[PDB]
């Protein structure tokens, strides 16, 4: 079958000679990143069996004599609406090639991964514009919301709830992409925005071609923005961030409020003011008491002082967003910074520098307590992003056919604390969706 | 407390000698119209229960010197976000005042009452006209869902679904007003909309005064018309359709229904092409099964072939209403008619003529097989517009408190049928929300 | 030939009852206005020999099986670019079929002749509001001018630089149509806006049906207002402006400054911010010198005082009108008035009542200089008018015809420095355009 | 004094990083090309004349707290109106930022000067492309202007009066930029369009550094480009156009002329489809038969076919533009061609190559009737070009003063009609605007 799509945006203006360079068999491991990011968007209705499924499916930009097209082979007919593509699902694809394309481009691979601190945060920046994601006449407004993928309906429908009453305010949704959490605050703000009258309300999705097959964006991501890698994504968050909202979740949340509470201990970033909650349904209580546990036990109460945790109570969390614009206005106000970028925002490169989760460096992590706390925050959210990529990301998942589970390791009390936290994860169905059996990725030594 | 919002539309620009006009002697009747509608739209998040509890509530329209005010004292406090009104809110306020005032202005309660079917025709052409509801440049997208204020999680999410699916095909939905399967369709659309990116979706909300707080508009409504009578509502409903979806429901469903099939019985509607889709979930199949043949033994087989009954399916009900469009559009055009408006629809004055539900006019009713079927059709709207005005409407509980229960009678036979739909309706809780005992205003003479 | 238009706006809503109630032969009168009007619009590429070149012109609003058509039969072929009409056309014609139909529902000719001074600004207020021309979200932005419809070559380039410099302080235009100087100001407006990216610049044009055949709109027109007659137009004039500037012209300039300065007398009005400034090029100077001298030997000192006269510097001009619109806004507000229409401004009746220039009604004024000023300028208003008339408008011309001239008398030296005015108008080629003899349809009793 | 602007476009997002490298003194040639491009803009209402007469103004791009600011320090005071900066002005200078480093990053002097023809060709293209220039879903519409910056009145009517007449039939306009017939066929479509009621009409100017000074950008232009060169501005009208009309001019106006014959005498451009029309009033009669009479002697017969001559008829201009749109439509249709840009034309590097106006390449070219007529109309373009860059270009003003006039050489026939044709040029006022003495840069060498 053939989809033969007329690009509304900037691909309607490709030359074929740009067409032929794009083409080039030089070209095809850019060529094919954009192929398999465009399959994770067809097929949003985990890695290792999705790219099994439709090894049919391939693209092709051609010049025809009606002008440019985006012929899509053998697409997932879930993106159809009698055999015409969802326009959002288009708008997304458009989006997808104008990422791939500006960062293929401009950067070199030696770039992404071995340019310093202040290069690596430009990065972030450049792709972000060229994106169109930053707006210097709109005032904080930008509520992240991380959370599990993989939840109950309990879960669920609270995130849905603090969606809506986030919207009623007014304030726009930033997700990472992806089922349970990542969704249902975007759905949720669409009824508040609605009944507010909200007209171009933002819902930024944020992602990377490693995590986009098993997170892929819904098409109610109005915005969607492909970071390079990992930690390029969690850059834009933070960068991004007018308020940080923390449902439950499995190890890609534990990733995320790692990386968060690491940076904002900084010294350089006692001055911050960005509003962080933690929040769930009452079903929630012992999760969020047993997180809090693991970080007060590991990182310190250093870093538990930087959240407030909100159990069962949607328009309270809306509220604490609210008052926080006005605190973060403040800030960036008084500190001469920009209000769609955080650049007084200080990011350590161990934050920043590329991880490729393979077993030697998973066992090189360095897991105890007598390291400054912000480096065994650096190396904790480390071993959290393996976790994730064995269990979801293709190279990841090959690792573990390669080599067995991963090995973590480190001193003896905060390896039983983690041992317990993943524990848990796992219990709850945090690891992965229903239907069969998790089998961990990872061993930890106790 | 006081809020005083500024209008945006045509009450910004109301004189003083209008305004006080509105507060003479001569207009009280229609001012307090203005007060008690305006309630019912607050207070949305039983025309005897709320009226009861924000006594206090008034309005007040005043030219102060930074312009005309519209004054809310003591309003519900859930129509409030910060101590701002809900801009959607704000919206329905002001097309509540536009109706009452166009209305009040143009027709005496004896044209209401008692004009020639023609004249009442026009009457909700002329009110519709008036509210920006006819759009002669659009072609027929409009869905007409019909369903219960009282249903369950399953029937709710399966009017959710059905939205969802509609939206996703282009079209725009109609509703009653008020909660269940009258909210359920909005939302799902919402997020189907959203998906296909279309700008000014149409949420047309069809009221009047006598349903209004019983059934009042959620702020997810975009176009709000109030009509004077129900009558003159469940015309607006069948001159905009261009397909109707009718989900499971209670007395007022049935009044819908049987309004509809009496109507399409008609020789000169012979010729019209207009959907007409009956579905519900999986657990509905009994429902159906007892209305199809309720509605088989009383108006007769035939009447049967005017609706498709869809069980378990929403993407095959949305392909029912898309296809049933480019029908609709066909049917217009052959017999040069409207898009906007079904001006070829033959309604008799006998489904025109308004009903006071007295124990007088209600046992009156000839509810015998033997009458002609559409005029048997025209008896039993009216006998199921008396249990929903027994139920929950002011005047229709004045009635009931002062003479005791309708009596309702006829052919024995009938009569058994009608008793055994309206005792499936109070078992399955349709009659009225949980919370209290249902006490049944009418009692079925068999 | 046929031109079957498909209008856009409410004429697409018409029912066919309301075009039966139209085309009715005891709604002539009103049919037939509308046609008038139309045709004035589509010849604007005086009212005795236009309206007899087009006899063979009529319209036709009639329901197809597509929509309702305005037929236009035999129009102006100037209307038209290969046999389309011009879109602005459309817009005023659409424009002109509002106004005489919402007049022509709501006032009889008794109301409009002879209500009370109240009534009749609320009758101006009405049809304004109607035609969407108030707008209480704008300060103050609206300057008037006024000007002779047969100017020279160095006069009209003049009132072309002056609406340049207003539209480059993002001022809006009010003009009462017609060519010259009531052209050339919004043509120089449009190139201000232009070079200011002013987004819905306001091109108001308002006349009525006796003069709109001498001096019809231009399709550069974005906003026609057609008022029920000469002094209701007036009104509109004063009641809308912000800032007024009155360009050299003839009887019907010397009409609208009289009215203008017969109300700013007024001790009730003595409170008002009201810019006026009288302005032309270098050639002008004689001309401004000897009506500012008129001005002082008929009304006074205390009508000098009421304007400005600046000679060549359209720069100057336009800033008076900016610093002009800053003590209008302060004015309005410290009065408790609206931005969009001046309900403080106090107009007396005898500048209201609608005046038949009849030869009987002409002779029966009062030119004497022992009356009250304001009441001398009301009569001078009225003499204007009769010339004016006699000109130009169809009534007027008649009257000529059957009467032979108006006779104007009052006293010795007033009739001396009136007739020494008139003379000045005829020599300078302001009472009638060139290319035939000027033939005074008056005389004045020296 | 300092004008601070804030960008409401991409500068709004420099970072500092860039910013720091504007101002490095690698790029000091290219922030220099910045000013003079800025200077030009400002002053608008010859490159040596009004450089040495605002030598204190200066622009400075810096971050402040509020955001990037764009410092115009002692700019020309005629761009403000009561100091504040024309809003189209503003968009002029984002558009000449926006230019000036796109080609600065992406292109060096070695590639403008000396890449291959698709490649000069392409970079046209992408420059023009980010510009935002092109636009994919719009069907033929946009008519190049050439004609004389030193026009007398009655010329600068008609070319008012061409562009009224093109405006009316919803067409765009492209013109060099600067005064005279550049400017008039802008200002007259402006009232077209508002007559037409066209939302977002185009008035695109190109131009190149080295002419700019000389002919500077008008605000009604609103969508401005900056070429790199004199060769790639003649690219970018002959790619864009959909039509040419062309004006009586001087040598800036033949060069464009021969420029057009040269390319569409060319075989592979025998297939196109583009309407020219050489036009202008009745007294412009023996200017142009003169002109034809110069083609028809030097590059034959033959190109005067290429084009139609118009005389004293600006509808009829019109008419052939809007008619020839069509054939235009259908060409690119045909050939599996662009709407928004010629890809099939065919343009020989002799048109590209960029010609720097020094005594040694003037005198190089081969003016001989005996060169294949494709090349000496090159080498015409190019002696054109080397007059107006003697007389109006500082570069080109260098070579004058250091090395006297440029000779001009070639066969004797050729060479005496090539004197006549300049010197009536000289004699009808084109070579230079009145109020000094023209003093010719060239000998022709009969």
């Given at each position: 079958?053939?989809?033969?799509?007329?690009?509304?945006?900037?691909?309607?203006?490709?030359?074929?000679?740009?067409?032929?360079?794009?083409?080039?068999?030089?070209?095809?491991?850019?060529?094919?990143?954009?192929?398999?990011?465009?399959?994770?968007?067809?097929?949003?209705?985990?890695?290792?069996?999705?790219?099994?499924?439709?090894?049919?499916?391939?693209?092709?930009?051609?010049?025809?004599?009606?002008?440019?097209?985006?012929?899509?082979?053998?697409?997932?007919?879930?993106?159809?609406?009698?055999?015409?593509?969802?326009?959002?699902?288009?708008?997304?694809?458009?989006?997808?090639?104008?990422?791939?394309?500006?960062?293929?481009?401009?950067?070199?691979?030696?770039?992404?991964?071995?340019?310093?601190?202040?290069?690596?945060?430009?990065?972030?920046?450049?792709?972000?514009?060229?994106?169109?994601?930053?707006?210097?006449?709109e005032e904080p407004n930008m509520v992240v919301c991380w959370g599990?993928?993989?939840?109950?309906?309990?879960?669920?429908?609270?995130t849905?709830?603090v969606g809506?009453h986030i919207g009623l305010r007014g304030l726009n949704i930033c997700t990472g992409?992806?089922?349970?959490?990542?969704?249902?605050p975007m759905?949720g703000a669409?009824?508040g925005?609605?009944?507010?009258?909200?007209?171009?309300?933002r819902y930024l999705?944020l992602?990377?071609?490693?995590?986009?097959?098993?997170?892929?964006?819904?098409?109610?991501?109005?915005?969607?923005?492909?970071?390079?890698?990992?930690?390029?994504?969690?850059?834009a968050f933070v960068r991004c961030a007018h308020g940080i909202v923390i449902f439950?979740?499995?190890?890609?949340?534990?990733?995320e409020l790692?990386?968060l509470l690491?940076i904002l201990?900084?010294?350089?970033?006692?001055?911050q003011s960005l509003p962080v909650i933690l929040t769930?349904?009452?079903?929630?209580?012992?999760?969020?008491?047993?997180?809090?546990?693991?970080?007060?036990?590991?990182?310190?109460?250093?870093?538990?002082?930087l959240y407030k945790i909100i159990?069962?109570?949607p328009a309270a969390v809306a509220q604490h967003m609210h008052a926080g614009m006005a605190a973060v206005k403040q800030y960036r106000?008084?500190?001469?910074?920009?209000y769609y970028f955080n650049?007084?925002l200080?990011?350590?490169?161990?934050?920043?520098?590329?991880?490729?989760?393979?077993?030697?460096?998973?066992?090189?992590?360095?897991?105890?307590?007598?390291?400054?706390?912000?480096?065994?925050?650096?190396?904790?959210?480390?071993?959290?992003?393996?976790?994730?990529?064995?269990?979801?990301?293709?190279?990841?998942?090959?690792?573990?056919?390669?080599?067995?589970?991963?090995?973590?390791?480190?001193?003896?009390?905060?390896?039983?604390?983690?041992?317990?936290?993943?524990?848990?994860?796992?219990?709850?169905?945090?690891?992965?969706?229903?239907?069969?059996?998790?089998?961990?990725?990872?061993?930890?030594?106790?």
């Amino acid at each position: 079958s053939l989809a033969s799509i007329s690009p509304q945006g900037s691909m309607s203006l490709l030359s074929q000679l740009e067409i032929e360079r794009l083409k080039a068999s030089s070209n095809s491991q850019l060529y094919k990143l954009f192929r398999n990011c465009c399959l994770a968007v067809l097929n949003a209705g985990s890695s290792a069996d999705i790219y099994d499924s439709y090894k049919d499916f391939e693209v092709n930009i051609i010049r025809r004599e009606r002008g440019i097209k985006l012929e899509l082979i053998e697409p997932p007919e879930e993106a159809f609406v009698d055999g015409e593509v969802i326009v959002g699902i288009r708008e997304l694809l458009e989006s997808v090639l104008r990422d791939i394309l500006f960062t293929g481009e401009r950067y070199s691979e030696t770039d992404l991964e071995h340019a310093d601190s202040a290069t690596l945060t430009h990065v972030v920046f450049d792709i972000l514009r060229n994106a169109r994601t930053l707006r210097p006449q709109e005032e904080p407004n930008m509520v992240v919301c991380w959370g599990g993928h993989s939840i109950n309906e309990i879960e669920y429908k609270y995130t849905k709830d603090v969606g809506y009453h986030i919207g009623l305010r007014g304030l726009n949704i930033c997700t990472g992409c992806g089922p349970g959490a990542m969704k249902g605050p975007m759905k949720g703000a669409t009824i508040g925005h609605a009944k507010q009258r909200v007209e171009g309300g933002r819902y930024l999705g944020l992602t990377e071609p490693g995590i986009i097959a098993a997170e892929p964006p819904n098409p109610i991501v109005n915005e969607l923005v492909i970071l390079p890698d990992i930690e390029k994504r969690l850059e834009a968050f933070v960068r991004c961030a007018h308020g940080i909202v923390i449902f439950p979740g499995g190890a890609g949340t534990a990733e995320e409020l790692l990386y968060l509470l690491g940076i904002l201990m900084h010294p350089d970033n006692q001055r911050q003011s960005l509003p962080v909650i933690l929040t769930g349904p009452a079903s929630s209580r012992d999760y969020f008491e047993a997180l809090d546990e693991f970080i007060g036990a590991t990182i310190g109460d250093e870093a538990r002082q930087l959240y407030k945790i909100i159990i069962d109570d949607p328009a309270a969390v809306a509220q604490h967003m609210h008052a926080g614009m006005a605190a973060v206005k403040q800030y960036r106000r008084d500190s001469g910074d920009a209000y769609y970028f955080n650049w007084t925002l200080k990011i350590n490169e161990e934050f920043q520098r590329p991880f490729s989760p393979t077993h030697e460096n998973v066992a090189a992590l360095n897991l105890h307590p007598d390291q400054p706390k912000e480096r065994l925050a650096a190396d904790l959210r480390r071993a959290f992003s393996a976790i994730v990529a064995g269990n979801v990301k293709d190279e990841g998942i090959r690792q573990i056919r390669k080599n067995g589970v991963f090995t973590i390791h480190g001193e003896q009390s905060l390896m039983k604390r983690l041992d317990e936290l993943l524990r848990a994860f796992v219990e709850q169905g945090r690891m992965k969706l229903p239907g069969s059996v998790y089998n961990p990725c990872y061993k930890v030594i106790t």
